[PDB]
Amino acid sequence: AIEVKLANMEAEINTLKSKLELTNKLHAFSMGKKSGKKFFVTNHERMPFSKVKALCSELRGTVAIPRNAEENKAIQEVAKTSAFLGITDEVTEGQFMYVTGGRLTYSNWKKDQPDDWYGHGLGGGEDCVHIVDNGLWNDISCQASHTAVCEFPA
Amino acid sequence: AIEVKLANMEAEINTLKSKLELTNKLHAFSMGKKSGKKFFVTNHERMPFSKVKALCSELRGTVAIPRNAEENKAIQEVAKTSAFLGITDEVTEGQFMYVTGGRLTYSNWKKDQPDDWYGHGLGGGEDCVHIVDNGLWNDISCQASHTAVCEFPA
Amino acid sequence: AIEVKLANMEAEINTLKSKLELTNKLHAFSMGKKSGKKFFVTNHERMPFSKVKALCSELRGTVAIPRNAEENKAIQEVAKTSAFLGITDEVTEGQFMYVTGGRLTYSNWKKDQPDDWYGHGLGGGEDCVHIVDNGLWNDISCQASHTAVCEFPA
């Protein structure tokens, strides 16, 4: 009986694993995930960049990053309002990098941006990035609060 | 070795438990749950209060209860139509109580309400409570059908 | 030792089964599944009929099928755009059948449809069906791309 029960629990475990995989697949689908496309999700809450990174990390995803015009539009649509992007120049001023490492391969900066502005009064300049009107990018204070949009693999 | 096999399966189970918790957190996030805020959800189905309590309990949740003006607005936005609240004066006419216990702390009654109206000729007065698109409360018959909105802990 | 651990593992597995069922129930509820009604879900992606079938099947559901005017309205509500239905006459031209088997009963064809049109130039006639804007049906090429909408049991 002991070995028979053990073999059954292995089957129970494998069955639950496939069932949870199905649950995740269905959830992604109902939330709009498209075939061969990473999917962006948000709870529409505004918060400082540090909280956005922690929260997406907690969800096993990353802070949304547009790699091309298409993805930039996808993120804009999900957010509906201004959201943070996983891009910053905290490591080297003026040199924007993906929070997930590397130099930029695509950008959609607003005219006269990035300008590492200090006038906001929160302290320091501007090392974070958010997507504003018309999907254009603006460098903004990481201390500022904007929409949290997380990314999951295609 | 059965002991090793058993240890290995315990580990597999712990991983599934972690993945399921992740699934639950992502679902809430994708549905708009705010940090430190309660999670209100609805299927937009109107039904008698009895139905709503049973439904929310089945989901291990409870009928939505606004504890302040903020939450009242949040519930209003999710329901988008008239929704029952987890408040009734069924036990003792005149003394409204939370379905989860205790005397009302916050309220937002409409003018001329509660009137424990009997004119609905549906049987008895009005011992339940529902919200209107305006956000104000009105006592209504528990036998009437209104939107089901369940809440989950912050 | 061994037998006690096995008993606890059985218990751990059952609580996991229980929690997963609850996750599935909550997901459906939050997506709008009405009591005693089947529930329709879509990711708003357009794709050839064979892909829609494959996808719904992967999710343990089937391509949406309107069995009456109410369900037809429900499906158009969910689709928001032209979507394929689980109905075709691929087996025997002129005799529409449900993908899950059986001859078509309730129908809601647009005037002058079905017409097994060839002029589309995709090759062959029209053996699939899609619901357009207004809820009416049209036979269309199974090779054309339309919104994927899956249904799950009441």
Ligand SMILES: CC(=O)N[C@@H]1[C@@H](O)[C@@H](O)[C@@H](CO)O[C@H]1O
């Ligand atoms: C939301 C936004 O774009 N803020 C920018 C700020 O980052 C800075 O560039 C400033 C320059 O004066 O202009 C503002 O409009």
Ligand SMILES: CC(=O)N[C@@H]1[C@@H](O)[C@@H](O)[C@@H](CO)O[C@H]1O
């Ligand atoms: C939706 C609503 O407000 N219903 C109320 C009803 O509860 C009762 O108070 C009645 C007075 O006869 O007035 C109605 O307007």
Ligand SMILES: CC(=O)N[C@@H]1[C@@H](O)[C@@H](O)[C@@H](CO)O[C@H]1O
């Ligand atoms: C979308 C739609 O209704 N397409 C139809 C097509 O199926 C075929 O019937 C054709 C014949 O003139 O008319 C088109 O309007």
Ligand SMILES: [Ca+2]
């Ligand atoms: Ca079993």
Ligand SMILES: [Ca+2]
């Ligand atoms: Ca900077």
Ligand SMILES: [Ca+2]
């Ligand atoms: Ca700037």
Ligand SMILES: [Ca+2]
């Ligand atoms: Ca009473």
Ligand SMILES: [Ca+2]
């Ligand atoms: Ca009363």
Ligand SMILES: [Ca+2]
């Ligand atoms: Ca009243």
Ligand SMILES: [Ca+2]
């Ligand atoms: Ca335990």
Ligand SMILES: [Ca+2]
């Ligand atoms: Ca045909």
Ligand SMILES: [Ca+2]
């Ligand atoms: Ca046609």
Ligand SMILES: [Cl-]
């Ligand atoms: Cl900064």
Ligand SMILES: [Cl-]
């Ligand atoms: Cl009553």
Ligand SMILES: [Cl-]
């Ligand atoms: Cl065809």
Ligand code: NA
């Ligand atoms: Na979900």
